[PDB]
Amino acid sequence: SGMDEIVKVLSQHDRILVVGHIMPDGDCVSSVLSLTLGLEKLGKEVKAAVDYKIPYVFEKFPYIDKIEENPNFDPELLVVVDASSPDRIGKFQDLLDKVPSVVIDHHSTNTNFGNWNWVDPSFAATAQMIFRINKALGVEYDSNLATLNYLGIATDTGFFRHSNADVRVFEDAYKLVKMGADAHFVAKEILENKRFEQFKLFAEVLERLQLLENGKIAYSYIDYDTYLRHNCTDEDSAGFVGELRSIRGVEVAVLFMEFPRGKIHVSMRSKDWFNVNEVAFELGGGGHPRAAGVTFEGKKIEEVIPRVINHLLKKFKEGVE
Amino acid sequence: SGMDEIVKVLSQHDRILVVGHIMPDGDCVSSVLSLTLGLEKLGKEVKAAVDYKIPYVFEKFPYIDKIEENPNFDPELLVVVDASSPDRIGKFQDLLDKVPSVVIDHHSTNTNFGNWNWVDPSFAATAQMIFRINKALGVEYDSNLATLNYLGIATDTGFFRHSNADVRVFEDAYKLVKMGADAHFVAKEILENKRFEQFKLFAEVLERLQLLENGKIAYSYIDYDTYLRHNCTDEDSAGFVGELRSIRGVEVAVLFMEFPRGKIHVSMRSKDWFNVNEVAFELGGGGHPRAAGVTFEGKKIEEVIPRVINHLLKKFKEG
Ligand SMILES: Nc1ncnc2c1ncn2[C@@H]1O[C@H](COP(=O)(O)O)[C@@H](O)[C@H]1O
Ligand SMILES: Nc1ncnc2c1ncn2[C@@H]1O[C@H](COP(=O)(O)O)[C@@H](O)[C@H]1O
Ligand SMILES: [Ca+2]
Ligand SMILES: [Mn+2]
Ligand SMILES: [Mn+2]
Ligand SMILES: [Mn+2]
Ligand SMILES: [Mn+2]
Ligand SMILES: [Mn+2]
Ligand SMILES: [Mn+2]
Q1: Considering only CA atoms, which residue is closest to atom 21 of ligand 1?
Q2: Closest by Cβ to B167, choosing from A177, A193, A272
Q3: Cα A113 to chain centroid, rounded
Q4: Packing angle between helix B126-137 and helix B3-12, nearest 10 degrees?
Q5: Which residues have C-beta within 8 Å of that of residue A178, sequence separation ≥ 6?
Q6: What's the start-to-end Cα distance of chain A, in Å?
Q7: Which of A227, A233, B25, B212 has CB atoms 3.0–4.6 Å from B217's, for a disulfide?
């Protein structure tokens, strides 16, 4: 239930599979690799897996190839990081009824689906929890491990810009940089790694932009054919919803993205007060008060936009009251 | 010359004018207001001034109205922050050699134009120097002052993305947030304040973009008439050169900007290794190894662009 019990369970087991969530982000990659590498330094037999393509922005990160898509492994323990429910880990959820499982996560809506669960939403990033676990295990950090652990703290705080960038976040980043974390390398690879094609794709996003409530709600969409027409992928749209929120006067931005055909992810970002986690949660997704998402499969975009935006607008009007 | 001597000079004077650089950035606003408010806590009478319009993105920051354009004041001491040469403070350079002056700056190209000069280019932001000065003066921070001092560290590091964001930068950021600096407020005011016209302007920047040296060099330009066509000013283009550097494979991005008519500001940003301060300095400007600029007036943009590109390509191939 707490960190101490997790540390004991990790110490008790040797053959460990560490799994992150599908559609992985920086915190998923950071948490998976930092924990995997920490456990390996203890002499454990460990593999790492995510049931999803690892985005190209991570390709130069040290040990990125340790994260597998199709591991061949007979683990004694499954460790699930940064994933709020079983569906979030893809095909590895079939191991949950077969292999003892640890959950380490910072989502308030975590269903506590492990045999042991350490869930604390006061952390901005699961990577902060892995940091503390590794230290409690006696893991010695080198600069590569510091860099990998810094990654998740940076990405989940929007590089120290989001409402979750509190004193403990800054303290953790300070400690990791002191230990050799390459903060410039992480920013360059995540933020300064844009294919030029992303600009034309985003212009198409701007052209489709709809505004509601005196400009406080902004939403747009990318259909799958538009991805292909622009030689782009959902890896190319990753920062777009944040760019929509950066428009003056916008309080909540919503981006609907169809990739691949028939799979529609909708990203929600809010600025000052509106809880998008409650909207996403009620729609079957989840996240955090200022950043949340839900994924639909087998539905048509003309049907997804009304359902999401109508529910969003309902809650948004209730919030203004 | 060092901080201790500067602190002693500041303590010896009770009527002080603090001045920042023209075309102010977050570090300028942060350093000017942080030092002004710190000195006021010692009971001194302090005015703050910049000979330029304060950008709209600062207008919700606490005490921003303390920065004046036309202060009426008879100071005993002039303190110039974050400014590498007299030209950089506009009309307040007329006070040099009339009011004893202190320079506090982090530019390697600083000409040492004060009576006392503490210049240390190892700092990512002048705001870090002001933070240390306020602590040495015995100032106690509240959350508004911490926010004001955090601002310059954040903007001069590109919100912790530039290569100057070292352990001391993160130590200072941590200590200021511990004292109540509102890191989220700062990021939203500076970065989430974009006019729609800003996106239309950037599209024409993209339409003019050129890549050189196999995609390692990116440059574009905005002429004055294009600002007017999109109902924009230099405030709207402020983050554009950073957006050009974020293109994959680009090592140096350069943006030529004519605003107002007949004034050309050339902005440079580099990623991994190219010393743009050398290029800008040799052209009459200055800055840092990864961020520098130069301003021309009375020159034609069609003659400025080829000459600057020519010099940049020469320096790029050297080292
Ligand atoms: N399909 C989903 N189910 C549950 N939570 C999600 C989902 N998609 C996104 N989230 C959460 O929302 C955050 C950001 O939203 P997004 O950018 O839309 O993925 C993530 O870091 C997750 O915590
Ligand atoms: N006219 C100028 N003279 C000297 N340095 C400049 C000038 N303009 C910009 N810089 C430097 O370039 C850096 C980036 O600002 P800019 O290139 O103006 O966006 C700043 O930190 C300044 O030190
Ligand atoms: Ca669900
Ligand atoms: Mn995640
Ligand atoms: Mn996370
Ligand atoms: Mn999350
Ligand atoms: Mn400055
Ligand atoms: Mn500065
Ligand atoms: Mn400067």
Answers
A1: A287
A2: A177
A3: 18
A4: 60
A5: B167, B170, B171
A6: 38
A7: B212
To the question of whether residue A13 is assigned a binding role by annotation, the answer is: no
Residues in chain A: 321
Ligand nearest to the CA of A88: 1
Q: Look at the block and give the residue holding tokens 């790029």.
A: B316
Characterise A33 by phi-psi region: left (phi > 0), alpha (psi -120 to 50), beta (else): alpha
H/E element, B34: helix B26-41
Q: What share of chain A is helix, strand, coil (3-state, %, to 5)?
A: 45, 20, 40
**For residue A260, cis peptide bond before it (omega within 30 degrees of 0):** yes
Q: Among B184, B194, B272, whose Cβ lies nearest the Cβ of A161?
A: B184
Q: Does B187 touch chain A (CB under 8 A)?
A: yes
Six-digit token string for B49: 């001034």
Query: How determined?
Result: X-ray
Answer for the pair B193, A245: CB distance below 8 angstroms, yes or no.
no
Burial of B315 (0-12, 13-18, 19+ CB in 10 A): middle
Contacts of A195 in chain B (CB under 8 A): 248
Evaluate whether B161 touches A184 at the Cβ level (below 8 Å).
Answer: yes
Q: What is the Cα–Cα distance from A290 to B147, expressed in whole angstroms?
A: 21
Closest Cα in chain B, distance from residue A266 (Å): 21
Taking contacts as CB-CB distances below 8 angstroms, the residues of chain B near A168 are none
Do you find a cis peptide bond into A86, omega within 30 degrees of 0? no
Residues 81-110 of B with CB under 8 A from A: none
Domain ranges across chain B: 1-197, 198-319
Sign of CA dihedral B66, A163, B155, A34: positive
Residue numbers belonging to the annotated binding site of B for GMP:
84, 265, 267, 269, 295
Strand partners, B46: B16
Q: What are phi and psi of B257, to 5 degrees?
A: -135, 120
Cβ neighbours of A245 in B, within 8 Å:
192
At A115, the amino acid letter reads N
What distance lies between CA A178 and its chain's CA centroid? 25
How far away is chain B from the Cα of A305, in angstroms, using its nearest Cα? 23
Q: Going by CA atoms, what residue is nearest to atom 8 of ligand 2?
A: B293
Distance CA B65, CA A14 (A): 62
- A232 touches A245 (CB < 8 A): no
What resolution (Å)?
1.9
CB contact (8 A) between residue B170 and residue A173: yes
Q: Report residue A135 as tokens.
A: 């230290």
**Encoded tokens for B221:** 């330009």
Bridge partners (DSSP) of residue B77 are B16
